[model samples]
Target: SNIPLEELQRNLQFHAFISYSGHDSFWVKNELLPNLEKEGMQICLHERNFVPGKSIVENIITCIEKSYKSIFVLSPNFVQSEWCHYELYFAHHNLFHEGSNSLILILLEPIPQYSIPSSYHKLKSLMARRTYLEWPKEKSKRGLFWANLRAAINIKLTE
Candidate 1:
Protein backbone atom coordinates (compact mmCIF):
# COMPACT_ATOMS: atom_id res chain seq x y z
CA SER A 1 0.00 0.00 0.00
CA ASN A 2 1.25 3.47 -0.83
CA ILE A 3 1.15 6.27 1.72
CA PRO A 4 -1.05 9.22 0.81
CA LEU A 5 0.70 12.50 0.24
CA GLU A 6 -0.59 15.66 1.81
CA GLU A 7 -2.68 17.79 -0.52
CA LEU A 8 -2.33 21.55 -0.55
CA GLN A 9 -5.50 23.60 -0.11
CA ARG A 10 -6.71 24.88 -3.49
CA ASN A 11 -8.43 27.96 -2.17
CA LEU A 12 -6.08 30.11 -0.15
CA GLN A 13 -7.40 33.25 1.50
CA PHE A 14 -4.15 35.17 1.86
CA HIS A 15 -0.74 34.55 0.36
CA ALA A 16 2.63 35.79 1.55
CA PHE A 17 4.01 38.35 -0.90
CA ILE A 18 7.75 37.91 -1.32
CA SER A 19 9.62 41.09 -2.33
CA TYR A 20 13.32 40.78 -2.91
CA SER A 21 16.11 42.02 -5.15
CA GLY A 22 16.41 40.31 -8.53
CA HIS A 23 19.96 39.32 -7.72
CA ASP A 24 18.65 37.39 -4.72
CA SER A 25 15.96 35.56 -6.68
CA PHE A 26 18.03 32.42 -6.97
CA TRP A 27 18.36 31.98 -3.23
CA VAL A 28 14.80 33.10 -2.65
CA LYS A 29 13.54 30.47 -5.08
CA ASN A 30 15.73 27.64 -3.86
CA GLU A 31 15.75 28.30 -0.14
CA LEU A 32 13.21 30.80 1.16
CA LEU A 33 10.12 29.94 -0.88
CA PRO A 34 10.41 26.18 -0.52
CA ASN A 35 10.78 26.51 3.22
CA LEU A 36 7.74 28.77 3.45
CA GLU A 37 5.67 26.34 1.40
CA LYS A 38 6.76 23.43 3.57
CA GLU A 39 5.52 25.39 6.56
CA GLY A 40 2.08 25.73 4.94
CA MET A 41 2.43 29.37 3.91
CA GLN A 42 1.01 30.36 0.55
CA ILE A 43 3.53 32.45 -1.36
CA CYS A 44 3.09 34.89 -4.23
CA LEU A 45 6.42 35.30 -5.97
CA HIS A 46 6.74 37.64 -8.94
CA GLU A 47 8.87 35.46 -11.20
CA ARG A 48 6.47 32.58 -10.93
CA ASN A 49 3.14 34.41 -10.87
CA PHE A 50 3.76 37.52 -12.98
CA VAL A 51 2.29 37.69 -16.48
CA PRO A 52 4.65 38.40 -19.30
CA GLY A 53 4.16 41.55 -21.45
CA LYS A 54 1.94 43.13 -18.82
CA SER A 55 2.26 46.24 -16.66
CA ILE A 56 4.43 44.70 -13.92
CA VAL A 57 3.82 47.56 -11.50
CA GLU A 58 0.06 47.24 -11.61
CA ASN A 59 0.26 43.48 -11.32
CA ILE A 60 2.49 43.77 -8.26
CA ILE A 61 0.15 46.30 -6.64
CA THR A 62 -2.79 44.01 -7.17
CA CYS A 63 -0.96 41.10 -5.60
CA ILE A 64 0.14 43.18 -2.63
CA GLU A 65 -3.37 44.32 -1.95
CA LYS A 66 -4.63 40.75 -2.13
CA SER A 67 -1.99 39.27 0.13
CA TYR A 68 -2.54 38.96 3.86
CA LYS A 69 1.14 39.29 4.69
CA SER A 70 4.22 40.79 3.04
CA ILE A 71 7.76 39.52 3.43
CA PHE A 72 10.67 41.65 2.34
CA VAL A 73 14.10 40.08 1.84
CA LEU A 74 16.28 42.97 2.83
CA SER A 75 19.84 42.90 1.57
CA PRO A 76 22.34 45.69 1.01
CA ASN A 77 21.46 45.81 -2.69
CA PHE A 78 17.71 45.52 -2.15
CA VAL A 79 17.20 49.22 -1.40
CA GLN A 80 19.46 50.12 -4.32
CA SER A 81 17.02 48.52 -6.73
CA GLU A 82 14.15 50.81 -7.72
CA TRP A 83 11.59 48.03 -7.89
CA CYS A 84 12.41 46.71 -4.44
CA HIS A 85 12.19 50.21 -2.99
CA TYR A 86 8.81 50.73 -4.59
CA GLU A 87 7.51 47.45 -3.16
CA LEU A 88 8.76 48.38 0.29
CA TYR A 89 7.15 51.82 0.07
CA PHE A 90 3.81 50.38 -0.96
CA ALA A 91 3.95 47.74 1.77
CA HIS A 92 4.75 50.43 4.31
CA HIS A 93 1.83 52.53 3.13
CA ASN A 94 -0.52 49.57 3.34
CA LEU A 95 0.65 48.73 6.83
CA PHE A 96 0.20 52.28 8.10
CA HIS A 97 -2.84 53.58 6.27
CA GLU A 98 -4.64 50.38 5.38
CA GLY A 99 -4.14 49.04 8.92
CA SER A 100 -2.39 45.89 7.85
CA ASN A 101 0.18 44.91 10.41
CA SER A 102 1.29 41.68 8.82
CA LEU A 103 4.40 43.12 7.19
CA ILE A 104 7.53 41.13 8.00
CA LEU A 105 11.15 41.92 7.20
CA ILE A 106 13.80 39.25 6.68
CA LEU A 107 17.33 40.59 6.58
CA LEU A 108 19.50 38.65 4.18
CA GLU A 109 22.51 40.60 5.36
CA PRO A 110 23.43 42.74 8.30
CA ILE A 111 22.43 46.39 7.94
CA PRO A 112 23.62 49.03 10.34
CA GLN A 113 20.88 49.58 12.91
CA TYR A 114 21.15 53.34 12.55
CA SER A 115 21.32 53.48 8.75
CA ILE A 116 17.59 53.46 8.03
CA PRO A 117 16.27 55.89 5.41
CA SER A 118 14.53 59.05 6.60
CA SER A 119 11.24 57.96 5.07
CA TYR A 120 11.51 54.56 6.73
CA HIS A 121 12.88 55.71 10.06
CA LYS A 122 9.39 55.54 11.50
CA LEU A 123 9.45 51.82 10.77
CA LYS A 124 11.77 51.36 13.70
CA SER A 125 8.81 51.66 16.02
CA LEU A 126 6.85 49.08 14.09
CA MET A 127 9.87 46.83 13.92
CA ALA A 128 9.95 46.76 17.68
CA ARG A 129 6.40 45.43 17.68
CA ARG A 130 7.00 42.90 14.89
CA THR A 131 9.43 40.01 14.71
CA TYR A 132 12.31 40.01 12.24
CA LEU A 133 14.51 37.18 10.98
CA GLU A 134 18.20 37.70 10.31
CA TRP A 135 20.60 35.45 8.46
CA PRO A 136 23.73 34.56 10.33
CA LYS A 137 27.16 34.83 8.72
CA GLU A 138 27.80 31.18 9.55
CA LYS A 139 26.05 28.60 7.39
CA SER A 140 25.73 26.22 10.32
CA LYS A 141 23.37 28.66 12.02
CA ARG A 142 20.82 28.53 9.22
CA GLY A 143 18.54 26.18 11.16
CA LEU A 144 18.18 28.80 13.85
CA PHE A 145 17.36 31.41 11.23
CA TRP A 146 14.61 29.25 9.79
CA ALA A 147 13.27 28.59 13.24
CA ASN A 148 12.99 32.29 13.94
CA LEU A 149 11.16 32.91 10.69
CA ARG A 150 8.71 30.10 11.34
CA ALA A 151 8.13 31.44 14.81
CA ALA A 152 7.37 34.86 13.38
CA ILE A 153 4.69 33.33 11.20
CA ASN A 154 3.49 30.98 13.95
CA ILE A 155 3.98 27.88 11.86
CA LYS A 156 4.84 24.43 13.14
CA LEU A 157 7.66 22.51 11.55
CA THR A 158 6.95 18.81 11.43
CA GLU A 159 10.03 16.65 11.35
Candidate 2:
Protein backbone atom coordinates (compact mmCIF):
# COMPACT_ATOMS: atom_id res chain seq x y z
CA SER A 1 0.00 0.00 0.00
CA ASN A 2 2.98 2.27 0.40
CA ILE A 3 3.40 2.26 -3.40
CA PRO A 4 1.40 4.88 -5.26
CA LEU A 5 -1.71 3.75 -7.06
CA GLU A 6 -0.28 4.79 -10.42
CA GLU A 7 2.85 2.65 -10.09
CA LEU A 8 0.96 -0.32 -8.67
CA GLN A 9 -1.53 -0.29 -11.51
CA ARG A 10 1.23 -0.14 -14.09
CA ASN A 11 3.54 -2.75 -12.57
CA LEU A 12 1.27 -5.29 -10.90
CA GLN A 13 1.26 -8.20 -13.34
CA PHE A 14 0.42 -10.71 -10.62
CA HIS A 15 -0.12 -10.81 -6.84
CA ALA A 16 3.45 -12.02 -6.37
CA PHE A 17 6.54 -13.37 -8.10
CA ILE A 18 8.46 -15.94 -6.04
CA SER A 19 12.26 -15.71 -6.01
CA TYR A 20 13.76 -18.91 -4.68
CA SER A 21 16.42 -21.53 -5.23
CA GLY A 22 15.66 -24.83 -6.97
CA HIS A 23 16.63 -26.72 -3.80
CA ASP A 24 13.85 -24.91 -1.94
CA SER A 25 11.12 -25.53 -4.51
CA PHE A 26 9.21 -28.24 -2.63
CA TRP A 27 8.47 -26.15 0.45
CA VAL A 28 7.58 -23.12 -1.63
CA LYS A 29 5.32 -24.99 -4.04
CA ASN A 30 3.62 -27.33 -1.58
CA GLU A 31 3.26 -25.29 1.59
CA LEU A 32 3.86 -21.55 1.41
CA LEU A 33 2.58 -20.44 -2.01
CA PRO A 34 -0.54 -22.60 -2.06
CA ASN A 35 -2.03 -21.28 1.20
CA LEU A 36 -1.44 -17.60 0.54
CA GLU A 37 -2.41 -17.87 -3.12
CA LYS A 38 -6.10 -18.65 -2.95
CA GLU A 39 -8.43 -18.72 -5.93
CA GLY A 40 -8.03 -15.68 -8.19
CA MET A 41 -4.72 -14.76 -6.56
CA GLN A 42 -2.00 -15.29 -9.15
CA ILE A 43 1.52 -16.07 -7.97
CA CYS A 44 4.34 -16.50 -10.45
CA LEU A 45 7.14 -19.00 -9.96
CA HIS A 46 9.94 -18.73 -12.53
CA GLU A 47 10.15 -22.49 -12.81
CA ARG A 48 6.61 -22.45 -14.15
CA ASN A 49 6.25 -18.94 -15.52
CA PHE A 50 9.54 -18.40 -17.27
CA VAL A 51 8.77 -18.62 -20.97
CA PRO A 52 9.78 -21.85 -22.68
CA GLY A 53 12.29 -20.38 -25.12
CA LYS A 54 13.34 -17.08 -23.54
CA SER A 55 16.60 -16.24 -21.83
CA ILE A 56 16.42 -17.00 -18.10
CA VAL A 57 17.85 -13.61 -17.19
CA GLU A 58 15.27 -11.85 -19.33
CA ASN A 59 12.46 -13.75 -17.72
CA ILE A 60 13.74 -12.84 -14.28
CA ILE A 61 13.95 -9.18 -15.23
CA THR A 62 10.50 -9.08 -16.81
CA CYS A 63 8.70 -10.92 -14.02
CA ILE A 64 10.10 -8.77 -11.22
CA GLU A 65 9.36 -5.59 -13.14
CA LYS A 66 5.72 -6.57 -13.54
CA SER A 67 5.05 -8.23 -10.21
CA TYR A 68 3.27 -6.42 -7.38
CA LYS A 69 5.47 -8.16 -4.84
CA SER A 70 8.73 -10.14 -5.02
CA ILE A 71 8.70 -12.91 -2.38
CA PHE A 72 12.27 -14.12 -1.76
CA VAL A 73 12.38 -17.58 -0.17
CA LEU A 74 15.47 -17.23 2.01
CA SER A 75 17.49 -20.36 2.71
CA PRO A 76 21.17 -21.16 3.20
CA ASN A 77 21.20 -22.17 -0.44
CA PHE A 78 19.49 -18.99 -1.51
CA VAL A 79 21.89 -16.58 0.21
CA GLN A 80 24.89 -18.46 -1.18
CA SER A 81 23.82 -18.43 -4.82
CA GLU A 82 25.07 -15.78 -7.26
CA TRP A 83 21.81 -15.89 -9.24
CA CYS A 84 19.56 -15.47 -6.21
CA HIS A 85 21.58 -12.51 -5.02
CA TYR A 86 21.10 -10.89 -8.41
CA GLU A 87 17.36 -11.38 -8.09
CA LEU A 88 17.34 -10.05 -4.51
CA TYR A 89 19.18 -6.93 -5.61
CA PHE A 90 16.73 -6.45 -8.47
CA ALA A 91 13.78 -6.64 -6.08
CA HIS A 92 15.54 -4.28 -3.69
CA HIS A 93 16.05 -1.75 -6.47
CA ASN A 94 12.36 -1.67 -7.39
CA LEU A 95 11.19 -1.57 -3.77
CA PHE A 96 13.56 1.26 -2.97
CA HIS A 97 12.39 3.34 -5.90
CA GLU A 98 8.71 2.63 -5.42
CA GLY A 99 8.92 3.49 -1.72
CA SER A 100 6.83 0.44 -0.91
CA ASN A 101 6.95 -2.95 0.73
CA SER A 102 7.21 -4.65 -2.65
CA LEU A 103 9.63 -7.24 -1.31
CA ILE A 104 8.68 -10.09 1.03
CA LEU A 105 11.54 -11.96 2.74
CA ILE A 106 10.46 -15.40 3.89
CA LEU A 107 13.04 -17.24 5.98
CA LEU A 108 12.94 -20.90 4.96
CA GLU A 109 15.97 -21.82 7.11
CA PRO A 110 17.42 -20.54 10.41
CA ILE A 111 20.73 -19.18 9.14
CA PRO A 112 21.93 -16.41 11.49
CA GLN A 113 22.09 -12.79 10.31
CA TYR A 114 25.77 -12.38 11.25
CA SER A 115 26.80 -15.49 9.38
CA ILE A 116 25.87 -14.08 5.98
CA PRO A 117 28.75 -12.83 3.84
CA SER A 118 29.51 -9.12 4.03
CA SER A 119 29.70 -8.91 0.24
CA TYR A 120 25.94 -9.57 0.20
CA HIS A 121 24.99 -7.53 3.24
CA LYS A 122 21.86 -6.32 1.52
CA LEU A 123 20.39 -9.50 2.91
CA LYS A 124 21.13 -8.25 6.41
CA SER A 125 19.95 -4.71 5.64
CA LEU A 126 16.73 -5.90 4.03
CA MET A 127 16.01 -8.26 6.89
CA ALA A 128 16.54 -5.45 9.37
CA ARG A 129 14.16 -3.18 7.47
CA ARG A 130 11.23 -5.48 6.81
CA THR A 131 8.94 -7.78 8.77
CA TYR A 132 9.70 -11.38 7.72
CA LEU A 133 7.83 -14.65 8.28
CA GLU A 134 9.61 -17.85 9.20
CA TRP A 135 8.34 -21.13 7.81
CA PRO A 136 7.04 -22.98 10.85
CA LYS A 137 7.87 -26.67 10.80
CA GLU A 138 5.03 -27.17 13.32
CA LYS A 139 1.87 -28.21 11.51
CA SER A 140 -0.43 -26.86 14.24
CA LYS A 141 0.89 -23.31 13.89
CA ARG A 142 0.51 -23.27 10.09
CA GLY A 143 -2.85 -21.54 10.24
CA LEU A 144 -1.14 -18.54 11.76
CA PHE A 145 1.62 -18.88 9.18
CA TRP A 146 -0.86 -18.64 6.34
CA ALA A 147 -2.57 -15.71 8.02
CA ASN A 148 0.68 -13.79 8.36
CA LEU A 149 1.62 -14.41 4.72
CA ARG A 150 -1.89 -13.53 3.58
CA ALA A 151 -1.56 -10.17 5.31
CA ALA A 152 1.74 -9.52 3.58
CA ILE A 153 0.48 -10.43 0.10
CA ASN A 154 -2.86 -8.71 0.85
CA ILE A 155 -4.63 -9.85 -2.28
CA LYS A 156 -8.28 -8.85 -2.62
CA LEU A 157 -9.44 -11.39 -5.19
CA THR A 158 -12.91 -9.97 -5.78
CA GLU A 159 -13.16 -11.95 -9.00
Candidate 3:
Protein backbone atom coordinates (compact mmCIF):
# COMPACT_ATOMS: atom_id res chain seq x y z
CA SER A 1 0.00 0.00 0.00
CA ASN A 2 2.79 2.42 0.94
CA ILE A 3 4.70 1.42 -2.19
CA PRO A 4 1.92 2.64 -4.52
CA LEU A 5 1.55 5.77 -2.41
CA GLU A 6 5.21 6.69 -2.88
CA GLU A 7 5.06 5.84 -6.57
CA LEU A 8 1.96 7.99 -7.10
CA GLN A 9 3.51 10.91 -5.27
CA ARG A 10 6.62 10.70 -7.44
CA ASN A 11 4.60 11.00 -10.63
CA LEU A 12 2.30 13.78 -9.41
CA GLN A 13 3.59 16.90 -11.14
CA PHE A 14 1.88 20.24 -11.66
CA HIS A 15 -0.36 20.68 -14.68
CA ALA A 16 0.14 24.44 -14.79
CA PHE A 17 1.88 27.45 -13.19
CA ILE A 18 -0.24 30.45 -12.15
CA SER A 19 1.29 33.94 -12.58
CA TYR A 20 -0.56 36.76 -10.79
CA SER A 21 -0.06 39.85 -8.69
CA GLY A 22 0.06 39.73 -4.91
CA HIS A 23 -2.58 42.46 -4.97
CA ASP A 24 -4.90 39.95 -6.62
CA SER A 25 -3.93 37.16 -4.26
CA PHE A 26 -7.28 36.81 -2.55
CA TRP A 27 -9.30 36.52 -5.76
CA VAL A 28 -6.74 34.21 -7.30
CA LYS A 29 -6.62 31.96 -4.28
CA ASN A 30 -10.28 32.05 -3.36
CA GLU A 31 -12.23 32.50 -6.60
CA LEU A 32 -10.04 31.64 -9.57
CA LEU A 33 -8.20 28.57 -8.37
CA PRO A 34 -11.19 27.14 -6.58
CA ASN A 35 -13.24 27.29 -9.76
CA LEU A 36 -10.47 25.83 -11.91
CA GLU A 37 -9.69 22.98 -9.54
CA LYS A 38 -13.40 22.11 -9.58
CA GLU A 39 -12.32 20.72 -12.87
CA GLY A 40 -9.18 18.53 -12.81
CA MET A 41 -6.39 21.09 -12.77
CA GLN A 42 -3.38 21.14 -10.47
CA ILE A 43 -1.28 24.28 -10.17
CA CYS A 44 2.16 25.22 -8.87
CA LEU A 45 1.64 28.61 -7.27
CA HIS A 46 4.73 30.85 -6.92
CA GLU A 47 4.08 31.45 -3.23
CA ARG A 48 4.07 27.74 -2.55
CA ASN A 49 6.63 26.43 -5.02
CA PHE A 50 9.63 28.76 -4.86
CA VAL A 51 12.50 27.28 -2.88
CA PRO A 52 12.84 28.77 0.58
CA GLY A 53 16.43 29.97 0.23
CA LYS A 54 16.97 30.28 -3.50
CA SER A 55 16.56 33.35 -5.71
CA ILE A 56 13.12 33.79 -7.30
CA VAL A 57 14.68 33.68 -10.75
CA GLU A 58 15.92 30.20 -10.04
CA ASN A 59 12.50 29.12 -8.89
CA ILE A 60 10.76 30.67 -11.91
CA ILE A 61 13.16 28.93 -14.25
CA THR A 62 12.68 25.59 -12.54
CA CYS A 63 8.90 25.84 -12.21
CA ILE A 64 8.23 26.89 -15.80
CA GLU A 65 10.42 24.10 -17.03
CA LYS A 66 8.75 21.51 -14.87
CA SER A 67 5.12 22.57 -15.30
CA TYR A 68 3.18 21.65 -18.41
CA LYS A 69 1.66 25.13 -19.00
CA SER A 70 1.64 28.78 -17.89
CA ILE A 71 -1.57 30.54 -16.81
CA PHE A 72 -1.16 34.31 -16.48
CA VAL A 73 -3.75 36.26 -14.49
CA LEU A 74 -3.48 39.68 -16.07
CA SER A 75 -4.40 42.91 -14.32
CA PRO A 76 -3.01 46.49 -14.10
CA ASN A 77 -0.89 45.59 -11.09
CA PHE A 78 0.25 42.39 -12.68
CA VAL A 79 1.93 44.25 -15.54
CA GLN A 80 3.65 46.58 -13.05
CA SER A 81 5.26 43.91 -10.86
CA GLU A 82 8.96 43.44 -11.69
CA TRP A 83 8.81 39.75 -10.95
CA CYS A 84 5.71 39.47 -13.10
CA HIS A 85 7.56 41.15 -15.94
CA TYR A 86 10.32 38.59 -15.64
CA GLU A 87 7.83 35.76 -15.75
CA LEU A 88 6.15 37.37 -18.76
CA TYR A 89 9.28 37.56 -20.88
CA PHE A 90 10.46 34.12 -19.86
CA ALA A 91 7.05 32.63 -20.56
CA HIS A 92 6.81 34.49 -23.85
CA HIS A 93 10.14 33.05 -24.94
CA ASN A 94 8.93 29.58 -24.16
CA LEU A 95 5.66 30.28 -25.97
CA PHE A 96 7.49 30.87 -29.20
CA HIS A 97 10.35 28.38 -29.05
CA GLU A 98 8.66 25.60 -27.14
CA GLY A 99 6.54 22.99 -28.86
CA SER A 100 3.31 23.29 -26.91
CA ASN A 101 0.74 26.10 -27.16
CA SER A 102 0.51 26.19 -23.39
CA LEU A 103 0.86 29.93 -22.79
CA ILE A 104 -2.51 31.28 -21.56
CA LEU A 105 -3.73 34.83 -20.96
CA ILE A 106 -6.66 35.14 -18.57
CA LEU A 107 -7.58 38.82 -18.45
CA LEU A 108 -8.99 39.94 -15.12
CA GLU A 109 -10.41 43.24 -16.28
CA PRO A 110 -11.75 44.81 -19.43
CA ILE A 111 -9.31 47.14 -21.14
CA PRO A 112 -10.14 49.23 -24.19
CA GLN A 113 -9.25 47.86 -27.61
CA TYR A 114 -6.55 50.41 -28.59
CA SER A 115 -5.57 51.01 -25.01
CA ILE A 116 -3.98 47.66 -24.26
CA PRO A 117 -0.40 48.14 -23.08
CA SER A 118 2.51 46.88 -25.17
CA SER A 119 3.19 44.18 -22.63
CA TYR A 120 -0.34 42.99 -23.28
CA HIS A 121 0.42 43.42 -26.94
CA LYS A 122 3.00 40.64 -26.72
CA LEU A 123 0.42 38.07 -25.77
CA LYS A 124 -2.09 39.61 -28.17
CA SER A 125 0.36 39.04 -30.98
CA LEU A 126 0.53 35.38 -30.20
CA MET A 127 -3.22 35.49 -29.77
CA ALA A 128 -3.59 36.37 -33.45
CA ARG A 129 -1.01 33.67 -34.12
CA ARG A 130 -2.89 31.42 -31.67
CA THR A 131 -5.81 31.85 -29.21
CA TYR A 132 -6.45 32.88 -25.59
CA LEU A 133 -9.33 33.43 -23.11
CA GLU A 134 -10.79 36.52 -21.50
CA TRP A 135 -13.17 37.10 -18.60
CA PRO A 136 -16.10 39.23 -19.60
CA LYS A 137 -17.90 41.87 -17.58
CA GLU A 138 -21.37 40.82 -18.61
CA LYS A 139 -23.47 38.40 -16.56
CA SER A 140 -24.35 36.25 -19.58
CA LYS A 141 -20.74 35.93 -20.67
CA ARG A 142 -19.76 34.80 -17.19
CA GLY A 143 -21.41 31.44 -17.58
CA LEU A 144 -19.43 30.64 -20.72
CA PHE A 145 -16.14 31.93 -19.34
CA TRP A 146 -15.23 29.00 -17.17
CA ALA A 147 -16.08 26.50 -19.86
CA ASN A 148 -13.88 28.37 -22.30
CA LEU A 149 -11.08 28.36 -19.73
CA ARG A 150 -11.41 24.65 -19.19
CA ALA A 151 -11.06 24.19 -22.92
CA ALA A 152 -7.95 26.35 -23.02
CA ILE A 153 -6.35 24.27 -20.29
CA ASN A 154 -7.49 21.07 -21.99
CA ILE A 155 -9.52 19.90 -19.02
CA LYS A 156 -13.14 18.88 -18.46
CA LEU A 157 -15.24 20.41 -15.73
CA THR A 158 -16.83 18.03 -13.25
CA GLU A 159 -20.63 17.83 -13.28
Candidate 4:
Protein backbone atom coordinates (compact mmCIF):
# COMPACT_ATOMS: atom_id res chain seq x y z
CA SER A 1 0.00 0.00 0.00
CA ASN A 2 2.95 2.33 0.64
CA ILE A 3 4.61 1.71 -2.72
CA PRO A 4 5.22 4.67 -5.01
CA LEU A 5 2.98 4.93 -8.07
CA GLU A 6 6.00 4.41 -10.29
CA GLU A 7 6.87 1.23 -8.43
CA LEU A 8 3.27 0.08 -8.69
CA GLN A 9 3.25 0.36 -12.44
CA ARG A 10 3.49 -2.92 -14.34
CA ASN A 11 4.10 -3.28 -18.06
CA LEU A 12 0.36 -3.92 -18.46
CA GLN A 13 -1.46 -1.27 -20.47
CA PHE A 14 -4.61 -1.10 -18.35
CA HIS A 15 -4.83 -0.69 -14.60
CA ALA A 16 -7.73 -3.07 -14.42
CA PHE A 17 -10.06 -5.00 -16.70
CA ILE A 18 -13.63 -4.57 -15.46
CA SER A 19 -16.00 -7.52 -15.83
CA TYR A 20 -19.67 -6.73 -15.42
CA SER A 21 -23.04 -7.55 -16.89
CA GLY A 22 -24.56 -5.28 -19.53
CA HIS A 23 -27.46 -4.71 -17.17
CA ASP A 24 -25.01 -3.20 -14.68
CA SER A 25 -23.44 -0.78 -17.14
CA PHE A 26 -25.26 2.25 -15.79
CA TRP A 27 -23.70 1.88 -12.36
CA VAL A 28 -20.33 1.36 -14.03
CA LYS A 29 -20.59 4.29 -16.44
CA ASN A 30 -22.01 6.66 -13.84
CA GLU A 31 -20.50 5.86 -10.47
CA LEU A 32 -17.56 3.54 -11.12
CA LEU A 33 -16.11 5.36 -14.14
CA PRO A 34 -15.99 8.82 -12.57
CA ASN A 35 -14.55 7.50 -9.32
CA LEU A 36 -11.71 5.46 -10.84
CA GLU A 37 -10.95 7.47 -13.99
CA LYS A 38 -10.81 10.68 -12.00
CA GLU A 39 -7.83 9.21 -10.18
CA GLY A 40 -6.11 8.70 -13.57
CA MET A 41 -6.54 4.93 -13.50
CA GLN A 42 -6.92 3.31 -16.90
CA ILE A 43 -9.90 0.99 -16.90
CA CYS A 44 -10.37 -1.65 -19.56
CA LEU A 45 -14.04 -2.02 -20.37
CA HIS A 46 -15.44 -4.39 -22.96
CA GLU A 47 -17.62 -1.60 -24.28
CA ARG A 48 -14.67 0.61 -25.18
CA ASN A 49 -11.44 -1.39 -25.02
CA PHE A 50 -12.44 -4.48 -26.97
CA VAL A 51 -10.93 -4.71 -30.43
CA PRO A 52 -13.16 -5.08 -33.47
CA GLY A 53 -13.81 -8.26 -35.56
CA LYS A 54 -12.19 -10.73 -33.15
CA SER A 55 -13.99 -13.69 -31.65
CA ILE A 56 -15.46 -12.99 -28.23
CA VAL A 57 -13.22 -15.57 -26.56
CA GLU A 58 -10.15 -14.11 -28.21
CA ASN A 59 -11.03 -10.62 -27.09
CA ILE A 60 -11.69 -11.82 -23.57
CA ILE A 61 -8.29 -13.48 -23.21
CA THR A 62 -6.52 -10.56 -24.87
CA CYS A 63 -8.10 -8.06 -22.54
CA ILE A 64 -7.31 -10.20 -19.49
CA GLU A 65 -3.74 -10.64 -20.56
CA LYS A 66 -3.19 -6.93 -21.08
CA SER A 67 -4.73 -5.94 -17.76
CA TYR A 68 -2.92 -5.70 -14.42
CA LYS A 69 -5.98 -6.70 -12.41
CA SER A 70 -9.42 -8.07 -13.09
CA ILE A 71 -12.33 -6.44 -11.29
CA PHE A 72 -15.47 -8.53 -11.24
CA VAL A 73 -18.74 -6.78 -10.46
CA LEU A 74 -20.84 -9.46 -8.85
CA SER A 75 -24.62 -9.15 -8.94
CA PRO A 76 -27.71 -11.17 -9.72
CA ASN A 77 -27.47 -9.98 -13.30
CA PHE A 78 -23.81 -10.94 -13.51
CA VAL A 79 -24.56 -14.44 -12.25
CA GLN A 80 -27.15 -14.78 -14.99
CA SER A 81 -24.85 -13.59 -17.78
CA GLU A 82 -22.79 -15.99 -19.90
CA TRP A 83 -19.84 -13.79 -20.80
CA CYS A 84 -19.22 -12.99 -17.16
CA HIS A 85 -18.64 -16.70 -16.65
CA TYR A 86 -16.03 -16.73 -19.40
CA GLU A 87 -14.26 -13.74 -17.93
CA LEU A 88 -14.37 -15.31 -14.48
CA TYR A 89 -12.89 -18.51 -15.81
CA PHE A 90 -10.03 -16.77 -17.56
CA ALA A 91 -9.34 -14.51 -14.60
CA HIS A 92 -9.37 -17.47 -12.24
CA HIS A 93 -6.92 -19.26 -14.49
CA ASN A 94 -4.66 -16.22 -14.52
CA LEU A 95 -4.89 -16.01 -10.75
CA PHE A 96 -3.15 -19.38 -10.40
CA HIS A 97 -0.99 -19.20 -13.50
CA GLU A 98 0.60 -15.93 -12.40
CA GLY A 99 0.88 -16.99 -8.75
CA SER A 100 -0.95 -13.88 -7.70
CA ASN A 101 -4.48 -13.16 -6.66
CA SER A 102 -5.14 -10.08 -8.74
CA LEU A 103 -8.90 -10.25 -8.91
CA ILE A 104 -10.92 -7.55 -7.17
CA LEU A 105 -14.48 -8.54 -6.42
CA ILE A 106 -17.22 -5.98 -5.89
CA LEU A 107 -20.72 -6.87 -4.91
CA LEU A 108 -22.94 -4.48 -6.80
CA GLU A 109 -25.82 -6.35 -5.26
CA PRO A 110 -26.10 -9.56 -3.32
CA ILE A 111 -26.50 -12.99 -4.86
CA PRO A 112 -27.29 -15.56 -2.20
CA GLN A 113 -25.24 -18.73 -2.20
CA TYR A 114 -28.18 -21.11 -2.63
CA SER A 115 -29.30 -19.16 -5.65
CA ILE A 116 -25.91 -19.23 -7.34
CA PRO A 117 -25.50 -21.86 -10.04
CA SER A 118 -22.93 -24.62 -9.61
CA SER A 119 -21.14 -23.49 -12.76
CA TYR A 120 -19.96 -20.45 -10.84
CA HIS A 121 -17.88 -22.45 -8.36
CA LYS A 122 -14.92 -20.15 -8.73
CA LEU A 123 -16.98 -17.15 -7.67
CA LYS A 124 -18.49 -19.10 -4.83
CA SER A 125 -15.08 -20.09 -3.54
CA LEU A 126 -13.79 -16.54 -3.82
CA MET A 127 -16.79 -15.17 -1.94
CA ALA A 128 -16.23 -17.68 0.82
CA ARG A 129 -12.57 -16.80 1.35
CA ARG A 130 -12.31 -13.20 0.28
CA THR A 131 -13.59 -9.94 1.67
CA TYR A 132 -15.06 -7.97 -1.23
CA LEU A 133 -16.22 -4.40 -1.62
CA GLU A 134 -19.93 -3.73 -1.79
CA TRP A 135 -21.68 -0.73 -3.30
CA PRO A 136 -23.20 1.33 -0.55
CA LYS A 137 -26.49 3.00 -1.35
CA GLU A 138 -26.16 5.58 1.36
CA LYS A 139 -24.38 8.75 0.25
CA SER A 140 -22.51 8.81 3.57
CA LYS A 141 -20.93 5.41 2.91
CA ARG A 142 -20.16 5.96 -0.78
CA GLY A 143 -16.91 7.73 -0.06
CA LEU A 144 -15.46 4.80 1.87
CA PHE A 145 -16.73 2.33 -0.71
CA TRP A 146 -14.83 4.09 -3.46
CA ALA A 147 -11.83 4.54 -1.19
CA ASN A 148 -11.68 0.83 -0.47
CA LEU A 149 -12.10 -0.02 -4.14
CA ARG A 150 -9.32 2.31 -5.21
CA ALA A 151 -7.05 0.75 -2.62
CA ALA A 152 -7.89 -2.69 -3.91
CA ILE A 153 -7.15 -1.72 -7.51
CA ASN A 154 -3.80 -0.22 -6.53
CA ILE A 155 -2.61 -3.28 -4.64
CA LYS A 156 0.80 -4.57 -5.78
CA LEU A 157 0.94 -7.85 -7.65
CA THR A 158 3.29 -9.78 -9.89
CA GLU A 159 3.11 -8.87 -13.55
- lDDT order, best first, reads 4, 2, 3, 1
lDDT of each prediction vs. the true structure?
A: 0.64, 0.69, 0.64, 0.75
Candidate 1 lDDT trough over 10 residues, lowest sum: 1-10
Residue pairs with clashing backbones, model 1: none
At residue 101, give the lDDT of candidate 2.
70
- Top candidate on lDDT is 4
Model 4 lDDT per residue over 54-78, tens place = 8766676676777777788888888
Better of 1 and 2 by lDDT: 2
Give residue 85's lDDT in candidate 3 (0 to 100): 55
By TM-score, rank the candidates, best first.
4, 2, 3, 1
lDDT of 3 by residue, 41-79 (tens): 677787788888878777766666665566878666666
Query: What would the per-residue lDDT of candidate 1 be over residues 1-159, giving only the tens digit for each residue?
Result: 111113323333445678888888888989998987876776677656776786777666655665555677877666556334464655646433433445668878755665556566445555565456877878899999988776654432122
Model 2 vs truth, CA RMSD: 5.1
Clashing pairs in 2: none
Report RMSD (Å) for each prediction in the order shown.
6.3, 5.1, 6.1, 3.3
TM-score of each model, in listed order: 0.66, 0.76, 0.70, 0.83
